[PDB]
A paper describes a structure:
ABCG2 transports uric acid and plays an essential role in the pathology of gout, but also confers resistance to a variety of chemotherapeutics including topoisomerase inhibitors (i.e., mitoxantrone (MXN), etoposide, topotecan, SN38), anthracyclines (i.e., doxorubicin and daunorubicin), antimetabolites (i.e., methotrexate and 5-fluorouracil), and photosensitizers (i.e., pheophorbide A). There are more than 200 known ABCG2 substrates which have highly diverse chemical structures and functions, and the substrate spectrum of ABCG2 is substantially overlapping with and yet distinct from that of Pgp or ABCC14. In this work, we used cryo-EM and biochemical assays to characterize the structures of ABCG2 in the unliganded state, and in the presence of the chemotherapeutic agents imatinib, MXN, or SN38. In total, our results delineate a new paradigm for the conformational transition cycle of ABCG2, and reveal how different chemotherapy compounds distinctively alter the conformational space of the transporter.
We subjected purified and nanodisc reconstituted human ABCG2 to single-particle cryo-EM analysis in the absence of antibody fragments or bound ligands. In the apo state, ABCG2 adopted a single predominant conformation that was distinct from that seen previously with the Fab or ligand bound transporter. In the absence of 5D3 fab or bound ligands the TM helices adopt a closed conformation while the NBDs remain separate in a nucleotide-free state. In the apo-closed conformation the TM helices form a tightly packed helical bundle near the cytosolic region, primarily as a result of the intracellular region of TM5 residing closer to TM1 and TM2 of the opposite ABCG2 monomer. In the apo-closed conformation the position of TM5 seals the crevice between ABCG2 monomers where substrates and inhibitors bound in the previous inward facing structures. However, in our apo-closed conformation TM5 is also rotated nearly 180° along the helical axis, thus generating an entirely different overall protein conformation. However, the helical rotation of TM5 observed in our apo-closed structure causes the Phe545 sidechain to face the opposite ABCG2 monomer. In the apo-closed conformation the positioning of TM5 results in these sidechains being oriented towards the dimer interface, such that a sulfur cluster of 10 cysteines and methionines along TM5 and TM2 is formed at the central 2-fold axis between ABCG2 monomers. Whereas the middle portion of TM2 (residues 434–438) adopts a helical character in the previous inward facing and ATP bound structures, this stretch of helix unwinds and bows outwards towards the lateral sides of the transporter in our apo-closed structure. However, as a result of the helical unraveling of TM2 observed in our apo-closed structure the Phe439 phenyl moiety is flipped ~180° outward and away from the 2-fold axis.
Numbering used by the authors:
A (entry chain A), B (entry chain B): 35 to 46, 61 to 301, 328 to 354, 370 to 654
Amino acid sequence: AVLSFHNICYRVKEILSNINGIMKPGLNAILGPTGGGKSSLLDVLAARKDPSGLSGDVLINGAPRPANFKCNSGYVVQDDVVMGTLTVRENLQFSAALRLATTMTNHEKNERINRVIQELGLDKVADSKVGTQFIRGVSGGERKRTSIGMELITDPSILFLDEPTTGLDSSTANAVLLLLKRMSKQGRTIIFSIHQPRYSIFKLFDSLTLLASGRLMFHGPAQEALGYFESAGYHCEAYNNPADFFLDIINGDLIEKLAEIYVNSSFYKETKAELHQLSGTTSFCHQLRWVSKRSFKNLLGNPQASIAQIIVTVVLGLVIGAIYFGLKNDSTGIQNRAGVLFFLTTNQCFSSVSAVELFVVEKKLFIHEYISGYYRVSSYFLGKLLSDLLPMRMLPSIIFTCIVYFMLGLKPKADAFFVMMFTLMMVAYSASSMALAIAAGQSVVSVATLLMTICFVFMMIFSGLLVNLTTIASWLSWLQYFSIPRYGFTALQHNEFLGQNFCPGLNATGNNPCNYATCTGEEYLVKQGIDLSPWGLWKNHVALACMIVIFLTIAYLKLLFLKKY
Amino acid sequence: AVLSFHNICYRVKEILSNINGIMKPGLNAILGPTGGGKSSLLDVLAARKDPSGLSGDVLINGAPRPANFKCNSGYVVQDDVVMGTLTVRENLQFSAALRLATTMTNHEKNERINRVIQELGLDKVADSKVGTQFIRGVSGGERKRTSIGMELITDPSILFLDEPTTGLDSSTANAVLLLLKRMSKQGRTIIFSIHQPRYSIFKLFDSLTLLASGRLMFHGPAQEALGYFESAGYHCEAYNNPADFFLDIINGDLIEKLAEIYVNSSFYKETKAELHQLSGTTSFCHQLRWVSKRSFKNLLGNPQASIAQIIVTVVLGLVIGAIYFGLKNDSTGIQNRAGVLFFLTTNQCFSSVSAVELFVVEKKLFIHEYISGYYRVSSYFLGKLLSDLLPMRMLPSIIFTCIVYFMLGLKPKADAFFVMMFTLMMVAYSASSMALAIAAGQSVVSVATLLMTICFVFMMIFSGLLVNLTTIASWLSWLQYFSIPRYGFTALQHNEFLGQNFCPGLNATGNNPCNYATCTGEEYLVKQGIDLSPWGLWKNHVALACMIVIFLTIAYLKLLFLKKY
């Protein structure tokens, strides 16, 4: 596996100049200051970057680079994206099930997993929970070892890291670079950038590249990496770090005069002499079923924002049941009976912000797993919102309805239960999908100010219970069609107020000089301005379903049109 | 200025062992691994740490350390706490006005400021806005120079840094350590820790301490810092970093056998021979007036969460005015007239979360400025909540009331305006102080879930407008006394529904077999269950004032009982 590249003048203003070199099958490194091309040449050498502004020729083993390159390579990204709620073995089982083909068997796949575990030396922590400095089960070094082990299951013939030392102890950094030299002895070429190395980890490198501010300063083996600058008139001082001295040369202790010495060097010509000789998946159900399993296990790992929602739903169910237990077929009736229906509708207004972060907390993981070819965007999307839907959208409406009707008995049908439970599910899931679509990239004040403004306007003002909607002039009355709880309130009124008279032998209908001698619900739905046909019960459900589809399409398009490079 | 210390066995489990040394007036450094006492001995040498578990003797110039030590020293903390919305000169003017005494003059103080500016070399950025990688006006190095310059106005005879290199470019790090050696030539002793130094910045150090895992490994000058380990049998390898080699010795390439070589060394005895010879504000109005000025200028620097609140308040004022413009003295009256009063009361429900972060975003700055003796806790508290109160609590109620009554005319008094404006101010400031007290240390889901649960329960359920409160049994009706908008709703009903009959020549009072032949507000307040005396208007204001005082006392005690060490 010989990765090669030639004159890659990457421009987005010209962040890389003309650059060429050959990545021999060893422990190739890329050094330099942070603002240079140390992290950009690595993304150019992987895909990891907009291929439009390349203007170069990256080439593997003589042939140019395929589009099927991120599926056969491996990019261990810098910030550890590994799941800090799963164990090591069920991180690697996940990556095995989504990177290895389904044609092979679970027996062979688990042999591959424990082969990688015994290779990387993870066996004493092969069932502890990985941590992210959130819940402590592993070290930092074994966490980095898991991030390396995930991109080894596919057996990559060419492996990319991205600063595999930063944020670590020097003992763990020396141990992980010794791990890379151990795993590099199978011919597996390893290419990485490093921030501020030391002379301990410098004999490890088979070849060495060095970029500064977009220019190439050196590309050759480390045994004459010092000899180049010792040929250019500089002197390595006594007991001085050479890798740090490479930076002390290029910080001014100009760079246009320092770059050209490599242009007229000997390794420029020897590199170009070989370089011109070189130049002349998985089924959808499987990805859905594994993403949903991973998110279920993550939700069991962090059940703190979910049992909080279950606790508040039980407390709200008990409170609204106790308030509604004091409502009978009496004179103190319909005006508070229409208040408890609004409470039943908007009982899940608090839980809408719990799904504001569903594709935001793991987006550095989503971008990496998508462009490494694990799953599709639609598959990740459906597998994630099939994992928030069951225990955080459908379950609290189940337990809220079974707590409300435990403190009750109003229409014994066992179908008013089902249509109420479906209405609460539709209202809760519609408001939660609105919080997915409308609020994604915002702060801690802005998300809650936004979701309380569209709790003011579209739940208290326009979902008309305390201003009658057929008095507003017809340029502000149209905003009642955008409000979630008006549909749920209408669908619960149409289920509550059908047939019952609420006045046991006290009609008094016909008191014309008086006011409001009307008590039945059939002459209350027309006063509220809502339908009486059975289409008037399901018009609200089809409107909420249209809102769910539109908000989930906005939440899907915000995932599809994400800069994944 | 000779800082000295002897046998400081700090324990919180015994994170420091017995430790002694002498900080000569130079450029003393403290090295080692991160988990050792590199950052803990520095906090022990400053105050910066619980003085209970010290068990040692820190001593300056022969005399023991005064309690007036943080006011005369200077601690440049690691994470830059400098304000990223003010300029350099008005950071230093702030620190001058709160650290230099009020007995001297502004003329001399500004001479001190531009003396420090011309000394540290900040003059070409002496009026640019400091940034925090938020709004870019300075570099990182000039930002660190501002953090150094703030703790130089008091003219400290002994200056503490805390890793003044990490997160910087190596050019800026070498320039800032050359700045420390430049400013150290006036006898100003400088004591710092460093994470991973290089041999470029090693000749600078006058003396050098080195801790590892709580034990002292070396304390002496840097010219024999290598000679100690070259006397202990180790060999410094060719072209190898000595400062990194100090870590390569102590990472195992045990430590109980490596520590005792310094115990039987020559510098142990020579240090102990001198060590045993050694051992044998500002007015409250000024601090309030400068903290409030700093927070006003910070609010002008980031007017993005405030003009958002002003924009939403104008839009809500226009919407509620347009809905209320369709309400007359007609039959479609009191039931929606009691809905628009609830909208007027809870129009600032969205802005309550905008003050959830007021002492949370700057708490690393507050802890440092308190224990460096800038201000009192009560002074910072009052100066900060006098700066959120005017443009984010009082101003939107002003413009909401002047937008609502611009689209109106209901009781021309110019006193209903004032009592409505005061009621909206009290409700808004009470809900915002509740969001200060109840939610401080929480996440992005938890803050909004909490402030929407106590928007469900204490604003829609129990602030009774859509369930009549005098039907609930008297074990859940008591929760109406904890709700903010019930008081504002009662205080606006008592101002709206006094005297007016709402029925122009259509009384019909006395229709006993019929239902609800009552139209006047005086027989509507008794139906709502609220008072008619003028005490019934101000009982709600004194209850809201009690809530403001209790929630602000909780927000003050959470600032007082904060671990400031």
